[PDB]
Amino acid sequence: AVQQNKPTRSKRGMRRSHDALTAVTSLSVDKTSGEKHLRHHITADGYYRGRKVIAK
Amino acid sequence: METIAKHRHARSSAQKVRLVADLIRGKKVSQALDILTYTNKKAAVLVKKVLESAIANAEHNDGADIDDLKVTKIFVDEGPSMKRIMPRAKGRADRILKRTSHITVVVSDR
RNA sequence: GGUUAAGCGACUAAGCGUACACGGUGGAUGCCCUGGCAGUCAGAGGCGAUGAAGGACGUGCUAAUCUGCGAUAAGCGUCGG
RNA sequence: CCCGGCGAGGGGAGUGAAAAAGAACCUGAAACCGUGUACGUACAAGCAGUGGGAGCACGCUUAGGCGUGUGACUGCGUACC
RNA sequence: GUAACGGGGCUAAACCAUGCACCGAAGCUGCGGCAGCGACGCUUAUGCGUUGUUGGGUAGGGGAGCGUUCUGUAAGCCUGCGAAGGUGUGCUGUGAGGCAUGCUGGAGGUAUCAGAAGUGCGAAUGCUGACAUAAGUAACGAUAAAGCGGGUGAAAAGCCCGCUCGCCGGAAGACCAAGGGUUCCUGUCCAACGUUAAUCGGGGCAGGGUGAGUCGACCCCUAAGGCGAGGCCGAAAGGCGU
RNA sequence: GACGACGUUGAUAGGCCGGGUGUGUAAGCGCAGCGAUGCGUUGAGCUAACCGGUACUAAUGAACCGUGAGGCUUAACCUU
């Protein structure tokens, strides 16, 4: 139910070896507006594949 | 030459913030800003503001150029904790710790 | 120099350990005394129905607390310094 | 004066013998948590040290074959009250 | 789980008799150093020239020392040309220790020979403060339920407005006593408090709000019971009662 | 996590078209009856995960990681 000995700080680091997180490989560029955006997502301005989707 | 910006007494544990900091260590400032923009973590917002402040200090005080800046050093340190009491069952009481941290960023032309 | 075969063979660190350099957290140590402790030599050994000990509420150019004071209310008269 | 939400928190300028004396303020030890550099570590089994000992890095040296950090491999070895 | 040579293996590397070599301990010998106790040299305020021998150790007995705070020696000596304290390095003694010096620190420290003790910590499920581990794991408090448009804002699943959906309805609606004591209304702010965010709040700050001859209290009257002039009783205090 | 299929030179998923299956004669209108109901139009209407088809909607041009002929010694071989 509970530990019998105190784990070491070395053992703590080993468990966290899989905790690192990854970053986006790259960002797409709109053909008309020109700004960066996440792939398969609309731009902040409101463009998608150079169509100017509703940007209310 | 180096420029420094800091944010002390931030409401977040050092362990959580350190995860974001590892992403941008050694990267260029222009590339670093893009990475932080598309990271879905609370600590990403905090680190972003500190990085922007460091860049601004360069031109006004040191007269540097944006294109030549890159992140050379970055680390997080633990700060003071706050003590609180949380009631439990059977009349027992527990201690709650709210941790803070200090964030430092260094940008240089090297 | 080329091909084939046999034998031998460094360069990796997701993480971790030891040493050194520079920091964070924390408040020990040294230095300091308008506070305490134990005595000596002298004072005074009682206050109160002429309303006591101890309190409540008020009182300023004053919102709060402390000190002083009492509708004459951080004060009034007189004699001296 | 500058970044920021007319924020929090910081970077310059200025004051001072000193701001690593900036009000979370004299001196600022230990547990505990981080960044940088050198060396070792992914076919090897146990109180983690001790005796022997290759290689690598670095400081020296009238090459004086010495000093410092690291420790592949190997003999022995089951904490304290 | 081989498991009745420690193992591999052995027809000698098994057993009996005889002989000669070698390995093998902190035992013995060789070389250098320290200390205790004896006799001798009558050495000597005693160290040696020598000369023999001894030195595992709990309970416990005997002998000799190191360091810390305070008093005299001290109206002395060291110190802003840098004291105590903190952190490194080099040298030195048989040990507890001592001496010099770089950096930090910014005002006290103290020889020698004597004297006095709140004089030395790893343990007592010891006492107080600070910080770890499990772990970024359990959990976020009734399974009555939410969807979309617009507004404000640095930021909206939670705040404001609107249209739908769902739940209570002898209550989860409305008015009071007891108890609490500004939680009531308006403006403004988001550090802490709210088990998340927050522009919102019973949160922070400032201003405003409670109007009675008829409602209630006070007031007149008494129940259970309390107190009680004289009085009766009891060491004192005090008890009962008209 | 992993594993398999597909991304316009395209049937991967949804929708749509046809069929099947299940339930059992929809609504509206007309007729008979005082009325509740019955009968005709009619095996009607509706139909999830299934079968055979179909680019109407979504699967974007790019970008990123991974390199540039691959050690030494000896023997037999090219040159049995």
Structural domains for chain B: 1-110 (3.90.470.10)
Ramachandran assignment for A34, one of left (phi > 0), alpha (psi -120 to 50 degrees), beta (any other)? left
Is B38 within 8 Å of A24 when comparing Cβ atoms? yes
Annotated resolution, angstroms: 2.3
Residue recorded with tokens 């490989």: A25
Backbone angles phi, psi at B92, to 5 degrees: -80, 155
Experimental technique:
cryo-EM
* Structure-token pair, residue B77: 């340190």
Domain that holds residue A18: 1-56
CB-based contacts of A49: which residues, under 8 Å, 6+ apart?
A: A30, A31
**How many domains does one find in chain A?**
1
Handedness of CA A14, A18, A21, A27 (dihedral sign): positive
Is A38 within 8 Å of B23 when comparing Cβ atoms? no
* Structure-token pair, residue A32: 């008309």
Task: Answer yes or no: are the C-beta atoms of A47 and A54 closer than 8 Å.
Answer: no
Q: Which nucleotide is closest to A29, CA to C1'? A: F62
Query: Alpha helix locations (H) across B10-110?
Result: 14-24, 29-37, 42-57
Task: Answer yes or no: are the C-beta atoms of B71 and B77 closer than 8 Å.
Answer: no
Q: Mutating which of B22, B36, B38, B47 best tests the A interface, going by the most A Cβ atoms within 10 A?
A: B38
CB-strand contact B8/D, under 7 Å: yes
B53/B5 Cα distance (integer angstroms): 6
